[PDB]
Amino acid sequence: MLQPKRTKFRKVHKGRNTGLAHRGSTVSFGSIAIKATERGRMTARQIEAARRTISRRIKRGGKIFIRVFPDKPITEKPLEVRMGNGKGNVEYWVCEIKPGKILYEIEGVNEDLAREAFALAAAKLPFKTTIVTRTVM
């Protein structure tokens, strides 16, 4: 599970997820890529599982570029505990996802095999996705 090596603060506010991903929506490290189309959260375990699924089916014959990092800590209260007495304890890390954000790029693999790998990976994610290819403009 990817996690930051160090951080300034252990716990962060909940916040809100709105708007679009104007940055990071372009293919820059490969020819074919998978792109989210609805907003949500993506966890470290989901990142690893999708990466494993893609790598297995591509047979480790090309490069996989991961452009999502779970930098946001999330807390949870113990269990059988009443409200109050301070914020809960960090339990896992996530990455906020806005529509149009690219998740995985594939380089050096046949287009059909890459599309099939992305189709396998999409079954593990909690949001809709599509496939995009590099374009001049």
Next chain:
Amino acid sequence: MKTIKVTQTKSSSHRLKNHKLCLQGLGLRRIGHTVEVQDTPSNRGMINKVYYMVSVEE
């Protein structure tokens, strides 16, 4: 001086305070009441601020 007619077409019970004051400053006191007002930017400002509940005849 050119002039215009303003008619109130909705209730002001639950509107905002400044919108109520705009109606009062125009002189509209109830639904259906029609008032005659000089056409100046000062009055047009209140009319535009309360456009959604008034009708203007020019």
Next chain:
Amino acid sequence: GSTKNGRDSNPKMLGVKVYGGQTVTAGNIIVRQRGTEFHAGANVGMGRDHTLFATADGVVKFEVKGQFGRRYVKVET
């Protein structure tokens, strides 16, 4: 358990008191600031706590001047 946080200081009410275009008399405080966010110009005095005040009757004005880009506040008689 128990949280080890839960403390804060009382408010201080810092900020600007007189804006540009306003008339002031000698002694009126114009800006309350922890540091030198604004610098005194003509007819404006600086206190030990960096408070800016008027030293003459007139009208307040704000400007940007100098090589450092320092913001200045002055009074025009």
Next chain:
Amino acid sequence: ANFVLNAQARAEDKQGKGASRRLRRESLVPAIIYGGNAEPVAVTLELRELVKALESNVFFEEVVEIKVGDKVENVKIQALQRHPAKNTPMHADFKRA
């Protein structure tokens, strides 16, 4: 010669966020043409025709003629704004050639 895009004048009343959204609903893409010796010109192009041009690779490295009325403007594609999610074109810049 290969790329001849039809266009229409886009006046002031057709500019702004609301007018742009109305045009895109009507299936039109606003675009701007700028270059030396002449002032900027705002035009509106058809989405189908722009997409068909986009599929071609040479369209990015060749000159193209935009026709509005009897006027003809010879230009080259400079910028292309795309919807981050759907990827549909939304706006275009054209440098006079």
Next chain:
Amino acid sequence: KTLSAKPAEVQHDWFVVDATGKTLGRLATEIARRLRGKHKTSYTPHVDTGDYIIVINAEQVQVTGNKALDKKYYRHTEFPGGLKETNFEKLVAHKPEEIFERAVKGMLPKGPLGYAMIKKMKVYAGSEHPHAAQQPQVLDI
């Protein structure tokens, strides 16, 4: 000055309607109108001013879609677990008068006046009726 109709002055007239090939609900609405008396200028809510209606060929009424197989009639005996169910085809085969009575009473007012009003509808399966002595007139509705 606005006067109410007098029950002693009300005149009930007799009409006969054939239901072959007609739609149940659209016939029932008209039947309810005429039974209540909404078609007479002397209409009064608290007084019965309607007309006697005789339905013939009741078994030939029709419904659209798959309601012949899908429309469900329920009744409950107040004993535990006593819910009985049937469908339109079986019911129209067995007791079509029940079909018409349900349809009309569902639209008629609920109370003593409604109970009295629904008594002026006579439903018969065959093409014949026993009320020749009343000399009904043919009504196309």
Next chain:
Amino acid sequence: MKVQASVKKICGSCKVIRRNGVIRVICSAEPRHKQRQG
């Protein structure tokens, strides 16, 4: 019969049909490929 939510064609001997509003997959040779959606 395999009763399941997602019904697909496995081999080239399979056919997808609608019967009385029910999706069914029927295979000519292999009888185990019989699926129904539900």
Next chain:
RNA sequence: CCCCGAAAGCUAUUUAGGUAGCGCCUCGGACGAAUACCAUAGGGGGUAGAGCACUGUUUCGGCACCGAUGCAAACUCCGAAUACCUAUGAGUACUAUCCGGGAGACAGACUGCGGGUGCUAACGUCCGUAGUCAAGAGGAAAACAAUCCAGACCGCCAGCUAAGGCCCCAAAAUCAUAGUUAAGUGGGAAACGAUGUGGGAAGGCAUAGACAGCUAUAGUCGAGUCGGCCUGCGCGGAAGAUGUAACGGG
């Protein structure tokens, strides 16, 4: 009988369901536009957004450094709309200010918006901001304080409208035009599966005979067909105990 008409906040308290000062109500007196709405003119900002130039963190390449790439309540090279202060002015409104007599109140609730906490749970809890109830009837939502329309001085067997509606229960179109749906969908429930149907922009193939079958790549057969994308409506996914009971009913 007539007139006006709150609050459930801040500060302090062996204080937390008490009390006191201020804030909010009422009455009297002294004053008079000195007040408010809007327009115009001047003025500060560091939030929304955006960004990597500081702080921290993140990925890929080439020699602690360089190029590209991404993130932040306690980061900032930037940066609104609103809100706030002052000045001049038209119109419409008895406004603003001071002194004094009398209080009540200091357990609030729901809803929309910006947020902490919680599980982006609770008719949950804690702030800021606006409406309503509290202290407010009437019409609509089946019944339904906090939703929508609307503010009840008294009487009328008079007329026009708002929200919402016009087949019957039950007032008003079984109104008019052009389409869609076959599921009673309308009138509960997602990832996902398939293609029922309407529309849209493209693409492949054909009487030198395309497409499915069938007889020895050929040919009797013959004028359309093969496959993908977007889009409107619709199908399955769909199990609980009292009696149809997930259109108020027909």
